[PDB]
Amino acid sequence: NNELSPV
Amino acid sequence: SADAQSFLNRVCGVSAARLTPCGTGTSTDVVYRAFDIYNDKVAGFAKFLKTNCCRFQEKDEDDNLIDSYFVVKRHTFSNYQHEETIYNLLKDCPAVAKHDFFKFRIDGDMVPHISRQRLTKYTMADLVYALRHFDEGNCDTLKEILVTYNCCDDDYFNKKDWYDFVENPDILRVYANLGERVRQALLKTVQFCDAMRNAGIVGVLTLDNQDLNGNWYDFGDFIQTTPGSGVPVVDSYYSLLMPILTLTRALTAESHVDTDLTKPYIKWDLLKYDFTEERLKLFDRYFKYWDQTYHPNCVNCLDDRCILHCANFNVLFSTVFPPTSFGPLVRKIFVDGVPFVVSTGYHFRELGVVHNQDVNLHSSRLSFKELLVYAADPAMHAASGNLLLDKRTTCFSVAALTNNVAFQTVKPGNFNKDFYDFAVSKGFFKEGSSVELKHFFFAQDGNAAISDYDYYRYNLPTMCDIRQLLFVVEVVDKYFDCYDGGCINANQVIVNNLDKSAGFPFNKWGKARLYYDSMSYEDQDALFAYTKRNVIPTITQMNLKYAISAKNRARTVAGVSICSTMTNRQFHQKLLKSIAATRGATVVIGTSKFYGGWHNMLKTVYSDVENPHLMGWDYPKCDRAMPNMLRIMASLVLARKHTTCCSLSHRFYRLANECAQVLSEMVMCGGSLYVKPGGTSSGDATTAYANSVFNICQAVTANVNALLSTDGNKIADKYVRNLQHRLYECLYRNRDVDTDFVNEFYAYLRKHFSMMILSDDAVVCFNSTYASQGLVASIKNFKSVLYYQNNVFMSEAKCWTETDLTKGPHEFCSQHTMLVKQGDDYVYLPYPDPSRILGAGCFVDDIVKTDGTLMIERFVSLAIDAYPLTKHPNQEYADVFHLYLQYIRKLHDELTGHMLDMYSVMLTNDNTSRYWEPEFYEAMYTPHTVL
Ligand SMILES: [Zn+2]
Ligand SMILES: [Zn+2]
């Protein structure tokens, strides 16, 4: 799990 | 079962695969794997537990298990649709694994499954984690990986020390059997980036989404844009992987004719030294989507953070090019019509090509400083020598300056028989005693200097994690923040002793004094100004030491040239003097142990840690094994004080001079010239301070690696969890410095991990409950860091831990500690090994002993060293101090006796008795300085 824009 | 067997043959698609379950029915399979996570509440690179997967292994004709797996997974219907949408746009790339989407009913309801076909057992994250967190106590994954790809056999590990780099240098060969897989994976990653750009897809690439054949999967965090405008994010993929590219030598195929390992090597012409277009081609072939400017020649870099970035890529690319193209660049000039051969530039492995700015071809009679500069160069010495082929060593051999080879030996010591007899007559050296002699003068034979020089084979080219290093460098700089430096003039320089050697060839005509007298202040200033626009390479000489020790290996020092030393002093002395004048800091160079100093240092390091323990560690082959990237970094930190006195170009040329003079220069060993691969040269003007910078750097990186490899779902304190989340962003998501977080992390380190540093010796006081939870570094973290960032194995038998603070560190600077009562207050005192003191008494270089009446001050000094042993509980230890006092009295009586018998001179005993009474020696350890 590695996200672009978590917030 | 009907369900299990129907599931098996549905997993078997239209292909022809003979599958066999991995110990499961229709249920998932749980494993323990390395992941790179960042999801708004947890971040890091650590081993988690993988839960939702069913694995089937594949068979071949002869019913044997093969390294192919079908990995199926159940998830929610919305993820199924999204991943199927993304795959159909990417299905045609050859770097994408084959996916199969179907629906199966485990109960009255139907659930969707995604099957990936023909993966390997491990991924690219498992290998990187295994090599960056090495522990020989449990290394199952690394051993399995090595045997499954034919790097070695399974009985290779029955050898002991099979992993050690210094013992068993053969392991390097084993690790070089993985390079081609890594190269293939890189090429596939470039293809996948191109496909993502063309399809219009945006996402971050992680190492656990690529297997060891080079294929990609797991498109669940991707999103879609218009075709031709996709953007892949590759920052943590490449940075986490960089250290592994030099350990496996992944780029060895680039030195063959068609990048094929079954063909001969490329044949370059010997006159070529540029290779600037080859470097750009390599960069564009393997790092196409890394979006920061690369300068093949670091003379075009913008600041010192830029230089580190580009020199790191240069370290890797320079391994492809012939080794004879590196070093000084020479050409022909004319003086009064006669031709010379002089150096006009340099070709560095890390920095590229540098050309001198002030070179004149036609000139009349030359001056004093020009003569100095031309006599210092190796150009004329090497051009007029013989060709040499030295098969005793594996280093690069240049020339032989004469017609004979020299073989230098080391002599034994001199025996002081009177002191030994006096000691024997007082009950010393009996059988079963706890005091005995183990410090001697060891002798060496003819081929001892060359054997010692060949220890530079332990210096290897090393690539760093660049994004991790750029943060550690900012933290290391907070430690060197209370000092001031800058340039000084020739008339402000202080030299301790002017009767020491000037080096080669200047030691033919005098000592250093001769050169500080002949040169005026305006001559020295002009020489200093010349080195801010030009490079002057020099020659270092190797000298054998003649001293007392406990082990029988020859020791050597480097004598550096006067030209290098004179200018380095003017560049660095103001800062070096400022560090040595400070009390209460982390670096404790300049503080004395007398008059209460030892106590003050210990109380400062104890500070106010909460559950304090004490710790000390070891650096194997410290100066022969230091990677070049960390010596460069150490130089850049000391030069950050020159923000007003020097320009950017001036600073670059000073760095280039330092590298060409004390990092990879010509060394004269015997009467021949050799090339130094790297490492530090103990004997340059900034040795101990650079060692301090290096030591602090390794400690900071061990703490950073400890904190990020911890499962953040199990950290109870929410403040320490927010700190872990911010460390990851500042390493792999932020491109510029964040000064608020650098201050915060630096304070956290000064509260829980408190250091005392002296030029690679250290003591640490640390919070014990934080270290057990992984929040602070331990001895195992240091061991891991030294393995992948230093190329050594640290045995934990040379490290110590202490859980009681009323006993001071086990060892610091060869001293022990004891808490004694001195006039109403308890204090810490240092003491030596009794063997060292007695050996200094018994073995010496002639005259200096074997007649004590000629030098009685030697024994007064040795008694000052030995005084604190009177406080020891063991009785054989206090006898040492009393033996020294009685021998001093005996020598004084014997000396006054001689003068009266043969001559009639009568000596007086005025204020001499003080030397055989203990009050003179007690006052050296009491808190009030005298003199
Ligand atoms: Zn640059
Ligand atoms: Zn300056």
Short mmCIF file of N, CA and C and ligand atoms in Angstrom, two decimals, chain B residues 487 532 571 642 645-646, ligand 2:
data_model
loop_
_atom_site.label_atom_id
_atom_site.label_comp_id
_atom_site.label_asym_id
_atom_site.label_seq_id
_atom_site.Cartn_x
_atom_site.Cartn_y
_atom_site.Cartn_z
N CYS B 487 38.87 31.41 6.21
CA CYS B 487 40.26 31.46 5.78
C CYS B 487 41.06 32.42 6.65
N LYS B 532 42.91 27.87 -5.66
CA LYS B 532 41.48 28.12 -5.84
C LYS B 532 41.09 28.22 -7.30
N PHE B 571 43.49 26.73 4.97
CA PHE B 571 42.05 26.57 4.71
C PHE B 571 41.26 26.12 5.94
N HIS B 642 32.71 28.56 5.03
CA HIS B 642 33.34 29.47 4.07
C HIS B 642 32.31 30.22 3.24
N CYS B 645 33.89 34.00 2.77
CA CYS B 645 35.27 34.20 2.35
C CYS B 645 35.58 33.58 1.00
N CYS B 646 34.76 32.66 0.51
CA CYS B 646 35.04 31.93 -0.72
C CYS B 646 33.81 31.92 -1.61
ZN ZN C 2 37.39 30.44 2.61
#
